[PDB]
Amino acid sequence: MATTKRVLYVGGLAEEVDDKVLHAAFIPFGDITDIQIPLDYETEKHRGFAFVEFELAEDAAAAIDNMNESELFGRTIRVNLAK
């Protein structure tokens, strides 16, 4: 099976959370190669979720375990393999 295990889905993001906040919150688990945040151009705000891609799958795994249901900017977030 060749499907990646390096990309994580991160949901439950407060309005104040952006790519910088995400980088800072997930870098403790390992180097990150990409962070994508879908936007609504009518509002200019994100839709409450993002995808974080780690360099190593092992690091992505540790992040899922420690960050799923953790608190970020006052609320609970959801973290799991994106696909």
Side-chain angles (χ1 to χ4, degrees), residues 31-48:
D31 291 311
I32 292 165
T33 54
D34 187 278
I35 290 177
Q36 278 177 26
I37 310 182
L39 315 183
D40 178 8
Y41 71 84
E42 296 192 328
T43 63
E44 270 179 299
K45 294 172 177 176
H46 61 62
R47 304 192 161 90

Side-chain angles (χ1 to χ4, degrees), residues 40-81:
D40 178 8
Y41 71 84
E42 296 192 328
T43 63
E44 270 179 299
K45 294 172 177 176
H46 61 62
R47 304 192 161 90
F49 71 91
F51 296 104
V52 177
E53 180 185 65
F54 276 86
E55 248 197 66
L56 308 167
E58 59 190 289
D59 292 342
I64 292 178
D65 299 330
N66 300 99
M67 297 294 271
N68 183 225
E69 296 195 69
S70 67
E71 175 181 297
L72 181 59
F73 248 117
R75 70 181 68 185
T76 310
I77 56 171
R78 304 292 172 179
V79 188
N80 53 80
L81 293 172

